[PDB]
Amino acid sequence: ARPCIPKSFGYSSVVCVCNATYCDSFDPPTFPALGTFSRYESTRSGRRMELSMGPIQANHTGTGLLLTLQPEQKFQKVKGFGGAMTDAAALNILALSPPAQNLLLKSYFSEEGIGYNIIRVPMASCDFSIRTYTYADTPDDFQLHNFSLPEEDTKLKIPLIHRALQLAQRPVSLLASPWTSPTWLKTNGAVNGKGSLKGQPGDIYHQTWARYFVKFLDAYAEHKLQFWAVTAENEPSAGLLSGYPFQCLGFTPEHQRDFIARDLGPTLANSTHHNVRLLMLDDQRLLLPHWAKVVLTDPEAAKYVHGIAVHWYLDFLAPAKATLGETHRLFPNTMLFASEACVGSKFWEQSVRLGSWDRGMQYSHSIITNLLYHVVGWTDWNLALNPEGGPNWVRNFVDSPIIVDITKDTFYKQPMFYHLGHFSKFIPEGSQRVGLVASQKNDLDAVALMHPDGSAVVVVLNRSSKDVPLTIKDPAVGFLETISPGYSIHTYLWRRQ
Ligand SMILES: *[C@@H]1O[C@H](CO)[C@@H](O[C@@H]2O[C@H](CO)[C@@H](O[C@@H]3O[C@H](CO[C@H]4O[C@H](CO)[C@@H](O)[C@H](O)[C@@H]4O)[C@@H](O)[C@H](O)[C@@H]3O)[C@H](O)[C@H]2NC(C)=O)[C@H](O)[C@H]1NC(C)=O
Ligand SMILES: *[C@@H]1O[C@H](CO)[C@@H](O)[C@H](O)[C@H]1NC(C)=O
Ligand SMILES: *[C@@H]1O[C@H](CO)[C@@H](O)[C@H](O)[C@H]1NC(C)=O
Ligand SMILES: O[C@H]1[C@H](O)[C@@H](Cl)C=C[C@@H]1O
Ligand SMILES: *[C@H]1CC[C@@H](O)[C@H](O)[C@H]1O
Ligand code: NA
Ligand code: NA
Numbered sequence: 001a002r003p004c005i006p007k008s009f010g011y012s013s014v015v016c017v018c019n020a021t022y023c024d025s026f027d028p029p030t031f032p033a034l035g036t037f038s039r040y041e042s043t044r045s046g047r048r049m050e051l052s053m054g055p056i057q058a059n060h061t062g063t064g065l066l067l068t069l070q071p072e073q074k075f076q077k078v079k080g081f082g083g084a085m086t087d088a089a090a091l092n093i094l095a096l097s098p099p100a101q102n103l104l105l106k107s108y109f110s111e112e113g114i115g116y117n118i119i120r121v122p123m124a125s126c127d128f129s130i131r132t133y134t135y136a137d138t139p140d141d142f143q144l145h146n147f148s149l150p151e152e153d154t155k156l157k158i159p160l161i162h163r164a165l166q167l168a169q170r171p172v173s174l175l176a177s178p179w180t181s182p183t184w185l186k187t188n189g190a191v192n193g194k195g196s197l198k199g200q201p202g203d204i205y206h207q208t209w210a211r212y213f214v215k216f217l218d219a220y221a222e223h224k225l226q227f228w229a230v231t232a233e234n235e236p237s238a239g240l241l242s243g244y245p246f247q248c249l250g251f252t253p254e255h256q257r258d259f260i261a262r263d264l265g266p267t268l269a270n271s272t273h274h275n276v277r278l279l280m281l282d283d284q285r286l287l288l289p290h291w292a293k294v295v296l297t298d299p300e301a302a303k304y305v306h307g308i309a310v311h312w313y314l315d316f317l318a319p320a321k322a323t324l325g326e327t328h329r330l331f332p333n334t335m336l337f338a339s340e341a342c343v344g345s346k347f348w349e350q351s352v353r354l355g356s357w358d359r360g361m362q363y364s365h366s367i368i369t370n371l372l373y374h375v376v377g378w379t380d381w382n383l384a385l386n387p388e389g390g391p392n393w394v395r396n397f398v399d400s401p402i403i404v405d406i407t408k409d410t411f412y413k414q415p416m417f418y419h420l421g422h423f424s425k426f427i428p429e430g431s432q433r434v435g436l437v438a439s440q441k442n443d444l445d446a447v448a449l450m451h452p453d454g455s456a457v458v459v460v461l462n463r464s465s466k467d468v469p470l471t472i473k474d475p476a477v478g479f480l481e482t483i484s485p486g487y488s489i490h491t492y493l494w495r496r497q
Contacts, residue, residue, distance in 0.1 A: 001025045001112065004048040007412070009354035013044045015403070015412035020096075023103040024048065024413070028111035029425055029493070031455050037480050037494040040426070042418045044357040044487035049418055049425075056478040056494065065442050065470040069458070070435025071450060071496070076374045078431040078449065079337065080173060081367075081424035082118030083108070083380035083401070085164075088128035088391050090156035092384040092404040096411065104402060104411050105160070108383065109167040114421030117170045117429055119161060120339065120379050121227075123178035123216050125152075125191070126234070127246040127396045128382055132191050134182045135216060141182075142208050147215045149223075158223050170428060173228030175339065175379070176216065177282055179235075179247035181209050186249065194242045196250040201258035210259075210267035217273045227273070231282035231309050231339065232256055232264060238283075246394045253287075253294035256280060257301045265304030277306035282339055284314035285323040292327045296334060309339040310375070312366055313346075324373035335376045341366060342381035343416070344389055344398035351389030351397035357487060359399060360415025364461045364489050367423050368445045371433055380420060384411065422491045426457050444468060444484055458492040460484050 002025040006014035016024045026049060032038050035056050040049045060066070083089075093101055107113040124134045129152070138146035149158075165172055180191045185205050188195030198205045217227060232251075233239075239250025251259065260280065268276060281291050288308070296302045308327065324336055343359045344351040353359060367378045382400045389397030401417035404410075427449055436448035436458065443464040449457045456477075462468060462484040472480040477496055484490060 011355040013357035015355045019410045020099040025112045034495045040491040060479040066439035068473040073435035075433035079377035080117035082116040083383040084120040086128035089383040095406045109164045114424045120175045126179040136182045139184045177231040177234040191247045202262040206263040210263035229277035231279045235283045253291040257295040261301040279307040279309040282309040285310045286314040286318040288323040288327045307335040312341040320373040328374040338378040342398045360419040363416045364419040368447045371447045460490045
């Protein structure tokens with residue numbers, strides 16, 4: 001409804017500029033009339049989810065690329081898409097004027113924006129905090145009498161989450177993850193560095209830690225927030241590394257298995273929060289299938305584990321077939337869920353690259369690859385950062401789909417935002433991935449889903465410089481004659497009946 005105001009920062013594409021009085025917006029999604037398709041197009045050249053429509057033809061002839069929908073062939077159902085309400089994100093959002101804040105929140109959470117339905121919530125401090133703290137810093141408080149939410153939660157994160165929920169028309173699922181325990185529960189007595197819980201699963205340290213999860217959920221429940229899921233620990237492999245720079249808590253897969261079986265599983269199950277899902281791993285997919293095998297082959301751990309959460313940071317050296325594919329094969333009834341991604345965290349990556357088309361393509365390529373290998377959802381990291389990629393108490397700066405420029409009471413929506421939206425806006429919870437097969441080898445990334453009502457949604461990414469003419473065949477409906485321009489992403493929608 002309102003066009004992108006483009007600005008170049010000298011990278012491959014433009015950001016869209018928003019402030020207190022203006023932000024680009026979309027219309028709520030709709031399917032067009034039977035016999036017509038919709039196309040939403042974003043390009044490096046600056047098109048931002050532009051709507052066009054076309055006819056579905058009864059016939060097709062030619063030798064060009066054909067993508068054929070296989071609507072009967074069903075895969076995973078989609079949980080959703082969203083991002084993380086870190087301390088850093090909360091600070092950046094609230095540093096904007098109230099009108100600008102509302103436009104940012106609407107960008108993500110309204111149907112005039114990209115319809116996020118997941119928010120990841122850190123349990124106390126992480127690197128994307130300006131303060132190191134837990135919820136129970138009073139030493140040796142095994143009873144957790146001094147457990148409490150600080151202002152980071154009560155003043156910053158919780159009110160923003162409530163505002164996001166008000167804007168969202170879709171049901172929103174909250175996901176909680178801890179980085180570190182209180183230091184008095186840890187072998188190293190520090191928030192960072194190499195260190196695990198003291199002792200062994202089933203003991204006082206482990207029982208206290210499990211009870212901390214319940215205290216956290218109790219406290220958020222007092223604030224009228226309920227959780228869909230928690231993870232067992234953010235990046236448990238991190239705490240195994242000498243000199244790890246920020247908040248962590250080390251678990252081997254054996255340690256995680258035993259913690260879930262003995263402490264976390266029984267504790268949650270015997271609480272008012274028994275319906276909250278537990279996700280294991282919450283770490284790089286390079287650790288699969290090994291980690292899934294260790295945890296899920298133990299029935300006492302398995303009965304508590306709803307899903308496997310994966311992070312994207314080692315995807316470049318962990319092929320999806322050998323990790324996601326093999327895990328799905330062995331454990332087809334345990335969902336895979338992508339719970340954290342961002343560009344900028346790597347040694348060879350600058351933190352923020354305003355307007356980078358490459359980083360947009362990284363997001364969409366990742367989401368497509370995940371969807372093609374059974375993953376049910378995909379979650380960004382910080383919802384918003386400043387132009388430095390912070391704040392961050394160890395200066396571990398990274399990129400974010402929205403960058404906030406407080407001096408100008410402005411925020412910039414980057415290619416990553418639009419790439420994510422090509423999925424989030426058009427794929428409601430309960431959509432199902434269906435087959436889509438190419439007639440010939442090609443440079444495109446594509447995925448097909450069936451909307452809950454039976455309609456079709458297809459996303460096509462072209463990471464190459466070359467325009468690719470193609471046809472999409474829906475055997476029941478007809479043919480879509482289209483093009484995939486170089487450096488474009490398209491979302492196709494059409495009714496099937
Ligand atoms: C918040 O963001 C708004 C959008 O960036 C800001 O409004 C913009 O302010 C600039 C500076 O006054 C204006 O730029 C001028 O534009 C006209 C041409 O304008 C019209 O055509 C353009 C086509 O590009 C179209 O976008 C507009 O809607 C107008 O119809 C030039 O002739 C001038 O030389 C100068 O470049 C923009 O017109 C204006 N945009 C909008 C959408 O209103 C606003 O100032 C920002 N607010 C704060 C508080 O900073
Ligand atoms: C489509 O194909 C069928 C079968 O060959 C043919 O009868 C029909 O005339 C073709 N053209 C159109 C416009 O439907
Ligand atoms: C911890 O809680 C106990 C019991 O409520 C209370 O007596 C004590 O003052 C608290 N200590 C701190 C450091 O808040
Ligand atoms: O921008 C174009 C797009 O690239 C092609 Cl595929 C079709 C319709 C749009 O208007
Ligand atoms: C995911 C990657 C980047 C870090 O900022 C974050 O803490 C980690 O869990
Ligand atoms: Na709502
Ligand atoms: Na970096």
